[PDB]
Every structure is written in C-alpha cells, then in structure tokens.
Amino acid sequence: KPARKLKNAADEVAQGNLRQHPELEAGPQEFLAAGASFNQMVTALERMMTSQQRLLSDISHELRTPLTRLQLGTALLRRRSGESKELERIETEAQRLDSMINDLLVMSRNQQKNALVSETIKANQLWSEVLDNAAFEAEQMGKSLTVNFPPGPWPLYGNPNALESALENIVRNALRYSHTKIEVGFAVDKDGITITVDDDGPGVSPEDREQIFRPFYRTDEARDRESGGTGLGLAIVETAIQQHRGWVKAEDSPLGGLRLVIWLPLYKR
Amino acid sequence: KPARKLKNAADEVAQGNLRQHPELEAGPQEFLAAGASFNQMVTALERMMTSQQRLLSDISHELRTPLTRLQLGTALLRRRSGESKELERIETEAQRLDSMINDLLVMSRNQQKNALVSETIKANQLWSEVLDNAAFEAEQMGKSLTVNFPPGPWPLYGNPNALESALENIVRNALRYSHTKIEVGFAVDKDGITITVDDDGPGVSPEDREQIFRPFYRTDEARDRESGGTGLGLAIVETAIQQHRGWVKAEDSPLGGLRLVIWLPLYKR
Ligand SMILES: Nc1ncnc2c1ncn2[C@@H]1O[C@H](COP(=O)(O)OP(=O)(O)OP(=O)(O)O)[C@@H](O)[C@H]1O
Ligand SMILES: Nc1ncnc2c1ncn2[C@@H]1O[C@H](COP(=O)(O)OP(=O)(O)OP(=O)(O)O)[C@@H](O)[C@H]1O
C-alpha cells in the first residue's frame, strides 16, 4: 500500500538508517511527490547529521596529535630511565585518554541509540580501579579517603564505563569540595547496591540540593572559588544511574558536608 | 490531501523543522499509522541531533580527569627523578591537551545553550543586534564598519543564537585582525542569504585558508599578533552553518585582508 511504504520508511529512518527509499518513488500516484520529497529529506537530514559528526571526529584527531607525542615521550623515558611508579600512572592515564578519544570517534560515526554496549559486570571489578585512583588523588591533595565498606562480586547489568564514570565523579566532587576527609560506603541487599559518599567540607543549602544535578549549573556559593568548575558532573551521574534503572540523591553528610547516595538494582539471571 | 500532508511535512523537516506534525495524525484513514510513525521519527531525529552535542560535552568533561592523574604523575616524577628532556615533552603535551579540553568544554557549554531553541526567524531580526554592537566596537578601536547592504525580512529556520554567534564571530575576527576597515555585505535570492565579511587587515596564506576552520588551529603568522586562546571560533562557525544546510568559505578580500562568506538557505513554508 502507498500508506504502508511511508510507514515502513519513516520507521526505518527513525532507527537511524538515513538511506534512500526508491520504493516511495514507485507508482505514478498522488504519492510520487510525498516520496520524492521524503527521499530529498533523508539526504537533507544526512547532510545536517554528518556536520556535527565530522567536526567532532575532527576535534578527535587534533586531540590525538599531542597524546601521540605524550605516548611517544613516556615510552622514550622508560628506555632512558627506569619503570618509575609515576611513569606507570602517566602511562595508564594516556592509555585511558586514548580510549576516550576513540570513543569520541566511534560514538560520533554511530549516530544512534541502544549502542549502550550493556554487559554483565561485578561491582568489585567495576569500581575498584576507580577507588584506587581516587585514593591516590587524596594523598596528593593531603586529604583522607576511607572506604568504610568495599564492593563485592555483586551482579550488575549495563555500560561499565558509564557506571565507572558515575561514581568517579561523585567521589571526585566529594574530593574537591571537602576539607580533609571523604568516606565511601558500599551496601548490598537482595535488591541492590547502595553507594554513599560523604565529605568533610561545606554542604549545599537544602534548596540547592536538587538544582546541583542541573547541567552546566554550579551553586552560587562554590561560584567564588570555581577554577576547574563547569557544572556538568552530577547531571551526567543522574542520567547514567537513572538509565541504569537506579537513582541518585544528595543529603546532608554526618561528616558535616554533603552526602551523595547512588542506588543501583542487582542483575538477576 | 493525506498525500499532501506528508509532502508538506517531509519538505518542512528537510529544512530543519523537526517540530511535531499533528496534521498527519488527523482523519482515521489508512494514513494515521504513517503519520504517527512520522511523528515518532521527528522526535527520534531530534534525539539523535541533540545526542551528538551531549556526547561531546560529556567526553570532554570526562577527558579532564585522567589528564589530572597524568599531570599529578609527571609532577611526582619530577620530584623523584630529575627534569628529563622527555619529561618536558610529556609535561608540555599534557599542558596543550588540558588547555584544549578547557576550551573544548567552554565551546560545548555555549553550543548546548545556543542549540536550545529551534525556530522560524527573519535575517533582519537575527543579525541586526549583532551588527549594531559590532559597529559600536569599531568606533571604540577607531576602525570603520560599513555595511554595504543590510539584512531584510528574509526567512530562515534553525537556532537563532547558533546563527547569531556564527556571524558575531566572523565580524569580530574581521574586526580584530583588520587594520582600519570592515565591510559586511548581505545578499538575498530565491534560494538564500549570502553574507560576505571583508577586512582591511592581513589575509591568510592560500594554503592556510582551509586549515583555519580546524578546531584549535590558529595561523602561525597571527599567533604572534594576538595572545589569543582557542581557534575554535571558525570551526564552530563552519558547523553552525553546515548544520543549518549552508556553507562557509574564506577568500582573499579586495580590501586586502580576508573575506569570509556565509551562505544559508531560505526557509520555505
Ligand atoms: N561533595 C560536594 N560538596 C559540596 N558541594 C558539592 C559537592 N558536589 C557537588 N557540589 C556542588 O554542586 C555543584 C554542581 O556539581 P556538578 O557536578 O554539576 O558540577 P561541578 O562539580 O561543579 O563541576 P564539574 O563538571 O567539573 O564536575 C558544584 O559547583 C558544587 O557547588
Ligand atoms: N579576518 C581574519 N583576518 C585574518 N586572519 C584571520 C581572520 N579570522 C581568522 N583568522 C585567522 O584564523 C585563525 C583561526 O580562526 P578563529 O576564528 O578560530 O580565531 P581565534 O582567535 O583563533 O579563536 P576565537 O575567535 O574563538 O577567539 C585565527 O587565529 C587567525 O590566525
């Protein structure tokens, strides 16, 4: 049917397959024009799409040119001097950045959803690497990172990097805006993992506790010692967890600062 | 008539009008499904369009954290071992990458706010405010701003702030790098508005005329004249216009400097 040709084409492009439909330009009916205009429209949308897509994948390669020189450099230090414990942390951060750039590349070219690359993963595997790197950062800023309860072989379903980043942020946010201590508490039950990250520093006014989770938004109070302050962090967190069927809340910490709590459901086979 | 609803909707979205068409969900005909699937498709295409923007703001944000751990690491190598010739290269690459990310974060902060509202707008309404403020800036730096032809009630469809900013930059770049005069020329035809911005100042070598539009690229010649910062300006411009179904080119100005030409299609309906 000519009505069915359009149903099928509109539902196909909606998936993300902006390929031409010659099917809609068949039959000299009143529909030839609705099909030729739809065919024009896919190339029009493709034209608009491959614009953000290219001058993304462009940003990608110019970020790669100084990383490659950094990676080239570290590798030459290793050959001259030894295998310093710090060379390893510089090395692995370059490796960590190299993947995030190839993520800026593959995810631009995809231009679709469901690309969530969701797998089965254990809580202990997921955030161990996170916590270790967080613990290191504390020593460097002379603050105390105490993890009251560690994560265990607790099952989860979703994007590892997405969840990794959710906590990575919560803890760094806690690390930054604290005074001297950060406490991370894992909790597990028949329904889900409950991460609670407490800080030493100043809290956030009860009214602003909801606002923080707004993208590109920072509290007026923290806006007077800003520096490396964007306002992105917690809005990313909120999404990652909410799309992982869980929730995130901001409370008043008994440590005197702010409490962030992430709840995530367990993966049940 | 149900065939005409689709002609009109497909030709409207093709122009960037990703707004919902309730018209296609009228009449309990065989077309209700082709219209409901088309309506689903616009929100699907809008979701894709916005995602590519969110992706960058997120990837740039998360790229900042392993750098910090790099930068933390290098700084600790310096304290343990010496000031290795290679450590300097690793150090300066991290510096360049961080500066890039810092302003890559600034760009996507604006782009999200610029790409907030999509709508029908007249060329005269859009860039008048821009040009007036540009004209004022010229008097203040003792330069001449002459607008050979003003914009008229010419129809356009897209983000006002996105397009506003595209020209705002082209003219300011023209203003900065000029010696004494800046000429802006509007032109309109049955197909589109053609803005041409000419500068008195030094031009750009024919080989570098393509390079300029690269993110972070700032010509070696005009890297000594101004302390600057990014090089994103023209790379942002290129995207804004390219995603607004138009193009941007850099030619040799008859004013002796550089001329930039922005072509944008008219909104028809
Ligand atoms: N642990 C914390 N203690 C106190 N205030 C906090 C804490 N975490 C977040 N905030 C407040 O929430 C605001 C917004 O947080 P958000 O994650 O959205 O952005 P950001 O941390 O400021 O910046 P970035 O995007 O670089 O992470 C901060 O500016 C700060 O005022
Ligand atoms: N009108 C112009 N005349 C001469 N050179 C120009 C002109 N506009 C741009 N350029 C050159 O192209 C480079 C890149 O353009 P771009 O718009 O990114 O400017 P920018 O100053 O580097 O960055 P931004 O405008 O964001 O501050 C400039 O650094 C300069 O060398």
Numbering used by the authors:
A (entry chain B), B (entry chain A): 188 to 456
What did the publication describing this PDB structure actually write?
Here we report crystal structures of the full cytoplasmic region of CpxA, a prototypical HK involved in Escherichia coli response to envelope stress. The sensor kinase CpxA senses a variety of envelope stresses, including misfolded proteins, and transduces this signal to the RR CpxR through conserved phosphotransfer reactions. The full cytoplasmic region of E. coli CpxA (CpxAHDC), encompassing the HAMP signaling domain (residues 188–237) and the DHp and CA domains of the catalytic core (residues 238–457), has been produced as recombinant protein for structural studies.
The polypeptide chains of the HAMP domain were fully traced into SAD-phased experimental electron density maps of the CpxAHDC orthorhombic and trigonal crystal forms. Instead, the active site formed by the second, mobile CA domain is poised for catalysis in three independent structures crystallized in two distinct crystal forms (trigonal and hexagonal space groups), with the ATP γ-P and the acceptor His248 Nε atom well positioned for the phosphotransfer reaction to proceed.
